[PDB]
């Protein structure tokens, strides 16, 4: 059993690992972006609620009970 003249199998495993690591980088990036957008939408809804409350308060003052 002589020493291997080629390293094909190690190279194949390395190819798989490189692609997998790239996939992980992309997945992390996408997940972070999704979390950012979820927080942004939550803030937008909160601002809309505050605006509606302010409008209702002004209408209440106009009602003058």
């Amino acid at each position: 059993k002589a020493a291997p003249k080629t390293l094909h199998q190690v190279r194949n495993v390395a190819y798989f690992f490189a692609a997998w690591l790239g996939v992980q980088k992309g997945y992390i990036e996408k997940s972070a972006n999704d979390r950012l957008w979820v927080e942004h939408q939550r803030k937008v809804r909160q601002q809309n609620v505050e605006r509606q409350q302010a409008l209702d308060s002004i209408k209440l003052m106009q009602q003058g009970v």
């Binding site: 790239g22 997945y27 990036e29």
Partner: peptide, 15 residues
């Protein structure tokens, strides 16, 4: 090949 595969993997991972 490793570099190109890493880049393709990133593109697919973030879709």
């Amino acid at each position: 090949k490793l570099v190109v595969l890493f880049l393709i993997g990133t593109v697919l991972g973030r879709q």
